[PDB]
Structure formats: structure tokens, C-alpha cells
Scaffold this active site. Sequence first.
Site, short mmCIF file in Angstrom:
data_model
loop_
_atom_site.label_atom_id
_atom_site.label_comp_id
_atom_site.label_asym_id
_atom_site.label_seq_id
_atom_site.Cartn_x
_atom_site.Cartn_y
_atom_site.Cartn_z
N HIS A 154 0.80 -1.22 0.00
CA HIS A 154 0.00 0.00 0.00
C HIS A 154 0.84 1.27 0.00
O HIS A 154 0.26 2.36 -0.06
CB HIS A 154 -0.94 0.02 1.20
CG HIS A 154 -2.20 -0.76 0.99
ND1 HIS A 154 -3.34 -0.21 0.46
CD2 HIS A 154 -2.50 -2.06 1.25
CE1 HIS A 154 -4.29 -1.13 0.39
NE2 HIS A 154 -3.80 -2.26 0.86
N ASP A 173 -4.20 -18.51 -2.40
CA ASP A 173 -4.04 -17.09 -2.79
C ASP A 173 -2.65 -16.85 -3.41
O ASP A 173 -1.88 -16.00 -2.96
CB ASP A 173 -4.33 -16.13 -1.62
CG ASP A 173 -4.66 -14.72 -2.04
OD1 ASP A 173 -4.51 -14.37 -3.23
OD2 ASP A 173 -5.06 -13.93 -1.17
C1 LIG Z 1 -2.07 -7.89 3.44
C2 LIG Z 1 -1.80 -7.68 1.88
C3 LIG Z 1 -0.80 -8.40 1.27
C4 LIG Z 1 -0.56 -8.23 -0.12
C5 LIG Z 1 0.55 -9.04 -0.80
C6 LIG Z 1 -1.34 -7.31 -0.87
C7 LIG Z 1 -2.34 -6.59 -0.26
N1 LIG Z 1 -3.12 -5.63 -1.03
C8 LIG Z 1 -2.60 -4.56 -1.61
C9 LIG Z 1 -3.60 -3.88 -2.24
N2 LIG Z 1 -4.73 -4.54 -2.04
C10 LIG Z 1 -4.44 -5.63 -1.27
S1 LIG Z 1 -5.66 -6.89 -0.73
C11 LIG Z 1 -5.86 -7.98 -2.16
C12 LIG Z 1 -5.13 -9.35 -1.89
O1 LIG Z 1 -4.06 -9.39 -1.38
N3 LIG Z 1 -5.83 -10.60 -2.28
O2 LIG Z 1 -7.15 -10.46 -2.90
C13 LIG Z 1 -2.57 -6.77 1.13
NI NI Z 2 -6.68 -13.35 -3.90
#
Ligand SMILES: Cc1cc(C)cc(-n2ccnc2SCC(=O)NO)c1
Ligand code: NI
Lengths: 79, 238, 95
Positions: free
Chosen positions: C37, C77
Site C-alpha cells: 500500500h 491465494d
Molecule cells: C495484506 C496484503 C498483502 C498483499 C501481498 C497485498 C495486499 N493488497 C494490496 C492492495 N490490495 C491488497 S488486498 C488484495 C489481496 O491481497 N488478495 O485479494 C494486502
Molecule cells: Ni486473492
Amino acid sequence: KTFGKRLDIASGTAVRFEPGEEKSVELIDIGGNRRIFGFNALVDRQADNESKKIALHRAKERGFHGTKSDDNYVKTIKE
Amino acid sequence: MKLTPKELDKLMLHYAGELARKRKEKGIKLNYVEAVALISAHIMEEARAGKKTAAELMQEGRTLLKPDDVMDGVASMIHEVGIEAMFPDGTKLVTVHTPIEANGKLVPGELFLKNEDITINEGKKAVSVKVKNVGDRPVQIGSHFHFFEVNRCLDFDREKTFGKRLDIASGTAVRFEPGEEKSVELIDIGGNRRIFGFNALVDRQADNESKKIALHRAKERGFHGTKSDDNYVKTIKE
Amino acid sequence: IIKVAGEHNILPASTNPTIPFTVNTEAEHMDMLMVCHHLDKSIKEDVQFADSRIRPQTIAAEDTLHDMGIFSITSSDSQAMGRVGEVITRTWQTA
Ligand SMILES: Cc1cc(C)cc(-n2ccnc2SCC(=O)NO)c1
Ligand code: NI
């Protein structure tokens, strides 16, 4: 008190009410997936506490006796 | 020159009118085609000259032919003559109404009628309803419109008009000016009495069950004079 | 969001990087959240956002909910906060 319930009698039998008659009945929970479709179209979805409020509002608007749903009802996006 | 098809057609019309004028100068009584051509050609030349309006030409076209100039029966056949002509401000339509008076007795296609009246909507008993226009714009209602579903700015007892239409001649109408109040006569709709459309207040078979739904719908959409009671009970299909 | 796993019409699933709950889980997930983020620790709204996201309480509850039969499916995932070659292994580690 009767949402999601049916009579606790032998399968295929029935209970009769004459005009003016008053009596008590025994009710048990509906089994299976508890998906209720048809019958007066008061539910037509999964039976739970969220769907009970919609069913009570629908039953009051169509004049079913003994239905108590409060005033200032809040609609959802799909009713 | 770059002539268009319109210009060629009008050139032909001009010389048809010229032939009619030469035959009139020789003392020959004009027929139907000759009279129509003469009036049309005269109007086109006067509009080319540019000194008269179209409204003046509409009156000038009525003085060209005396009743003795045409054959017997011509004047009853010519009800109006229309012609488009180019003025200095562009192309305009000029219509000449009843250009020739009649002087003989021959009427081609004459109708000989009986003198008995025609009774329409026999066996239908009418009721009378007072109607007032409380809006600011005029309203006109045809003979076969479902009178329950007319413009919401008309104020009347709408309960008494369910399933009814105006008892007038088919294809005629009744007009309401702003502020105007008058009475009308209504009779029952015939046939199967299945009412579809018009404001979508019924869209089903007309009966006493469907009247309650229609009155509730009309009250919710603000139609004037609709009286449906409070604590309305909904059905499964509304 | 975890409250929908008690409902009749929901088929609930968990992804493998939160199971089993270990002593390195919270710090790893927090630093993954800060990278993806592009958050900064000097801003009070990015810190408030991050502390509402990770939540070691629900992460700790997830293993016990798996043992009770309230969660019903495990998955990966893959390459999007999850490990595609470790679904079966992390299931048996949790058991
Ligand atoms: C906790 C986390 C981990 C990662 C690798 C990405 C995100 N991340 C960033 C922007 N949006 C998201 S959440 C979508 C997701 O990770 N799976 O659907 C959050
Ligand atoms: Ni996912």
C-alpha cells in the site's frame, strides 16, 4: 414464534380448525438446508433472522392476523 | 441552367395553364382539368412577380373564373386548389378555397340520403359526471379513451368512471379549457373488457377486484378526485 | 468480516499465510501491508489504517475455528499473499 417451523405430527396427517375453534399445536424446526420457496411467497429465500423481518413486514402489509412488526421499518436493496 | 425535377414539373403545369387560358379566350367553357391548371398557373406567376403576400393570393384566386366560364358540374368537383410557389422569402403553400360558384344542377357523385337519424351505442345506459380542469393547460379527450385514466389535473369522482368511456360519436372529442367545468356522459366499455395501457393503472381484466388496485395506484400517483380508504391490504400481484 | 462464517448460505474459506498462527506472523503481515500500500509510519492515518487491518485477535481465532468445523475450505491465494506449494502442508501443520 412460528417462523421456520412445521407441525410435529406424523408425516401425511393433518390438524383441522372449525369456525370459531381454538386449540394448541406443537411445532418443530424445518430440517435440511432450510430454503423456503413458495407457499404464499412470504419468504422465497434462505430462512434466517434477516429474512424473518422481511417476512413479517410482508405478512403485515397483506393482512395476516397476529403479525407484529414495528413501525418505521427500514427497507433493504432486495425485498 | 441546372434544372431540378421540381422545376420541370412546374414548367409543364405552366403550359397546361396557358392552354386553358387560350381556350377560354376562344369562348370555350372550361372543364375540370383546365380550370385547376388555370388557377395554379396564375398563382405561380403572381408569386414570381413579388408584390403580393400569400394571404392576398388566397383571396385573389377566387375571382379568376365566373360561374358561366365552366361546364356544368365543374364547380361542385373543385373543393380547393393547392400550389406551392416561390416568393422573395422562399417557398410557401397557397390554398384557394371554393374558387367557383355553381350555376347548374349536375352534381357528379351526388349522395341521396334518407332522413332518419342513426342511433349509436344501442342498449348502453349512460351516467352523468361533472368534470373540472384545475390545471393551467387545455385538455382534449377522445371517444374510446378509458376515462378513469385521463390527465391527473382533471378533477372528478374517479370511482364512478372505472371501466367507462365517453358516449359520443366514434372519432370525436370533448375539450376542457383551463378553469372550465362541465358534465359528460359515460357508457361501459364493451368486448372482453381487458384494459391494457393508457397510464398503466389497470393492465388486466376490469372487474371489482381490479378497481381497488387501480384506485390505490391512482391515489399514490396523485390523480385528482381519487378516494381510496386508508389501511389498504396488498395482494400477491400488484 | 469473520462473522459471516456462522451463516447458513456462506461457504467460508481461509488462505494459507495466516495458518498456523506463529510468533513471526504478525510482523511479517504488517511489513507486507506497508510495502504493497506504500504506507508511511510518519502519517497518523496510515498507522490507523494498518492497525485496523492486521488484527492478531481474529488471526488467533482462525485456527480454533478451523478445529471446530466452522471454516470448511483451505486454499493458497497464490503469489498474491499466499504460497501455492504449501496448502496441504499448512493444513496438516494446523491440525
Ligand atoms: C495484506 C496484503 C498483502 C498483499 C501481498 C497485498 C495486499 N493488497 C494490496 C492492495 N490490495 C491488497 S488486498 C488484495 C489481496 O491481497 N488478495 O485479494 C494486502
Ligand atoms: Ni486473492
